[PDB]
Write a protein that binds this ligand. Structure first.
Ligand SMILES: *[C@@H]1O[C@H](CO)[C@@H](O[C@@H]2O[C@H](CO)[C@@H](O[C@@H]3O[C@H](CO[C@H]4O[C@H](CO)[C@@H](O)[C@H](O)[C@@H]4O)[C@@H](O)[C@H](O)[C@@H]3O)[C@H](O)[C@H]2NC(C)=O)[C@H](O)[C@H]1NC(C)=O
Ligand SMILES: *[C@@H]1O[C@H](CO)[C@@H](O[C@@H]2O[C@H](CO)[C@@H](O)[C@H](O)[C@H]2NC(C)=O)[C@H](O)[C@H]1NC(C)=O
Ligand SMILES: CC(=O)N[C@@H]1[C@@H](O)[C@H](O)[C@@H](CO)O[C@H]1O
Ligand SMILES: CC(=O)N[C@@H]1[C@@H](O)[C@H](O)[C@@H](CO)O[C@H]1O
Ligand SMILES: OC[C@H]1O[C@H](O)[C@@H](O)[C@@H](O)[C@@H]1O
Ligand SMILES: [Cl-]
Ligand SMILES: [Cu+2]
Ligand SMILES: [Cu+2]
Ligand SMILES: [Cu+2]
Ligand SMILES: [Cu+2]
Ligand SMILES: [K+]
Ligand SMILES: [Zn+2]
Ligand SMILES: [Zn+2]
Ligand SMILES: [Zn+2]
Ligand SMILES: [Zn+2]
Ligand SMILES: [Zn+2]
Ligand SMILES: [Zn+2]
Ligand SMILES: [Zn+2]
Ligand SMILES: [Zn+2]
Length: 550
């Protein structure tokens, strides 16, 4: 109705129908090695063109988006994933090193061409080792229909945990120990204050200004390394209007529990007394180890000033900030109602465990029997191009086949440990059938199949040690998208340690998107770089910084 998607609305099946705008958006990203003082302490970061939040990819529903990525670092390769982007018959643009491409080496490039076949909020980031968490990420905002109206779109709001030592600096101590990583702090959209060792304050807090009476869209993204956050705005109400790329029936709440890799679209109404209010992102202590959960805040400033002054507002009393949880299954109802259709589906189960390896012990996460051990130098797609009808997978490849077109897969991702994990499926919106605590008993647990929640990242929740630990999440998806899709824990360190598996989906029909050149050119350049730079060689052993390959 005077929109760039005229002739479609909130009720259009975006899995089947894509607006043809014939418009190409085009971005040039130089991935750089540098330095940044995000809370006023200097430390190394790796960045998209020098900015933290990387610049945002903006598109309208239905557009083609073309991201020219160039590696201008000296000691990392790169590969860039557009999280939540479906890549329908476009697998090779999904940017998972060791699956869909070789890593792009310094001074080489890779042009990502993908279609905007969803609308909503997400982000792109590296899928190359720990790099997304060095800062190689930025938002994706695809304009489209909304399930509630608002007045102003404030864009992305990123929530990270943060340390003054590098995620790569801490990696080796993470692997050699069974306790979680420790983070000093957090940032909201890349800012926070910081104070130590003098009582001097450095950096600054996030701030936005609401004009009274106005309705704002905020698009939350948990971009953190190892934190599940609960987000709120003192005295204000939040109207959840979408989960990941899927718009839901609006509903209000005090706080948004937000898992790593997840997005929530939020409408907030300047309907409180024009004053100053805490914006809070609080680490959930069951699965978050932060030194500063009280102090990851930002200022909501109402136009009717009170400038330069802190807020004095009280946090919503909503219970503890302990357990790491998703909105419940019934709270997340997709506006496009589609259901799970699991009749006669390939049933599958994957255990999640945390096991030691080698004489040092390195403690590795392990998904469906093995910790992933694949090869930058030899991505799956090369394997399947060299051998079209390959069936001899190696267990440490974490293959789960779905070779029959349009057949569903109902997967159980389950654990015995009192440790919860965000689980993200590439190439798909999965249908979230069950979610719970303790062990999963297919007789006692009732699968929601009628218009269940639909998204790309959801928690495998876990019970606390006093309640016996353990947990499971159940997902289902049709084989509707040929390609090799990573399925994995969205926690950085876990996925690098092997907490990842690969859907080898519709293998026969890889020729439907596969380009020899797009593959070879990059792999040759990466091979070229490995001959001269020690960092071109994937460390895969057990006395150093292990990389599963993704
Ligand atoms: C968190 O950080 C993000 C990145 O640092 C912030 O992203 C910004 O989000 C807003 C909301 O979508 C965008 O606003 C738009 O800007 C584009 C481009 O604007 C520029 O070019 C036009 C001409 O094409 C010019 O007229 C403008 O003055 C600008 O020079 C517009 O086309 C859109 O219609 C819209 O106005 C920003 O572009 C976006 N920036 C980046 C770098 O992605 C985000 O705001 C931060 N979140 C909060 C809450 O602060
Ligand atoms: C970013 O730049 C830094 C500084 O040049 C790189 O780190 C150094 O790495 C070399 C090679 O391993 C070492 O010999 C130096 O001692 C390091 N110096 C410091 C200050 O750490 C780093 O590898 C680069 N990162 C990339 C290319 O992604
Ligand atoms: C997998 C890989 O090569 N990662 C490296 C990491 O070891 C190094 O510490 C970092 C320095 O910025 O650059 C990158
Ligand atoms: C080809 C290769 O060496 N694969 C590695 C193996 O060497 C290593 O011992 C193991 C431990 O995670 O992981 C895998
Ligand atoms: O363990 C890998 C690496 O970790 C650190 C140091 O103790 C190094 O000497 C060692 O090689
Ligand atoms: Cl842990
Ligand atoms: Cu992601
Ligand atoms: Cu993804
Ligand atoms: Cu995990
Ligand atoms: Cu991923
Ligand atoms: K070679
Ligand atoms: Zn819009
Ligand atoms: Zn961990
Ligand atoms: Zn004014
Ligand atoms: Zn003011
Ligand atoms: Zn059916
Ligand atoms: Zn063969
Ligand atoms: Zn139904
Ligand atoms: Zn060559």
């Amino acid at each position: 109705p005077n929109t760039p998607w005229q002739g479609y609305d909130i009720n259009t099946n975006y899995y089947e129908t894509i607006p043809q705008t014939n418009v190409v958006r085009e971005y040039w990203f130089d991935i750089v090695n540098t330095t940044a003082a995000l809370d006023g302490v200097e430390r190394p970061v790796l960045l998209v063109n020098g900015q933290f939040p990387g610049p945002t990819i903006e598109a309208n529903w239905g557009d083609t988006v073309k991201v020219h990525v160039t590696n201008r670092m000296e000691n990392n390769g790169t590969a860039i994933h557009f999280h939540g982007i479906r890549q329908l018959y476009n697998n090779q643009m999904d940017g998972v090193a060791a699956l869909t491409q070789c890593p792009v080496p310094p001074n080489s490039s890779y042009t990502y061409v993908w279609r905007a076949e969803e609308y909503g909020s997400s982000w792109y980031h590296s899928h190359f080792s720990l790099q997304a968490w060095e800062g190689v990420f930025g938002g994706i905002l695809i304009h489209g229909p909304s399930t509630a109206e608002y007045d102003h779109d404030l864009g992305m709001v990123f929530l990270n945990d943060w340390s003054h030592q590098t995620v790569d600096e801490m990696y080796q101590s993470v692997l050699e120990s069974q306790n979680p990583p420790h983070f000093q702090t957090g940032l909201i959209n890349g800012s926070n204050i910081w104070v130590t060792a003098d009582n001097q304050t450095v950096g600054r807090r996030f701030q936005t200004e609401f004009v009274p009476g106005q309705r704002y869209r905020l698009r939350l993204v948990n971009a953190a390394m190892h934190t599940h956050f609960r987000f709120s705005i003192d005295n204000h109400d939040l109207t959840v209007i979408a989960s990941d790329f899927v718009p839901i029936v609006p509903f209000t709440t005090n706080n948004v529990p937000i898992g790593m890799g997840q997005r929530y679209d939020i409408i907030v109404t300047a309907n409180q007394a024009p004053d100053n209010y805490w914006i809070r992102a609080i680490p959930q202590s069951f699965c978050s180890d932060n030194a500063n959960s009280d102090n990851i805040k930002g200022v909501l400033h109402y136009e009717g000033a009170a400038d330069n002054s802190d807020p004095t507002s009280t946090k919503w009393d909503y219970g503890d900030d302990i357990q790491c949880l998703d909105f419940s299954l019934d709270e997340l109802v997709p506006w496009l109602a589609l259901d799970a259709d699991i009749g006669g589906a390939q049933m599958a189960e994957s255990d999640v465990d945390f096991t030691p390896f080698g004489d040092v012990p390195l403690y590795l996460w392990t998904m469906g029997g093995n910790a992933l051990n694949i090869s930058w130098k030899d991505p799956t797609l090369q394997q399947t191009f060299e051998d079209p009808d390959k069936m001899d997978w190696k267990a440490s490849q974490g293959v789960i086949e779905a070779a029959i077109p349009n057949k569903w897969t109902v997967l159980v991702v389950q654990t015995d440990l009192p440790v919860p994990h965000p689980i993200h499926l590439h190439g798909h919106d999965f249908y979230l059938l069950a979610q719970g605590f303790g062990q999963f008993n297919p007789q006692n647990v009732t699968l929601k199949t009628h218009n269940p929640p639909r998204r790309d990242t959801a928690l495998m929740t876990a019970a606390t040690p006093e309640n016996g630990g353990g947990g499971y999440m159940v997902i289902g998806f049709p084989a509707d998208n040929p390609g090799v899709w990573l399925i994995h824990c969205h926690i950085g360190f876990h996925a690098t340690e092997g907490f990842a598996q690969q859907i080898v989906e519709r293998q026969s029909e890889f020729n439907t998107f596969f380009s020899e050149d797009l593959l070879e050119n990059t792999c040759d350049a990466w091979d070229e770089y490995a001959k001269v730079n020690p960092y071109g060689h994937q460390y895969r052993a057990l006395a150093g910084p292990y990389e599963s390959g993704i």
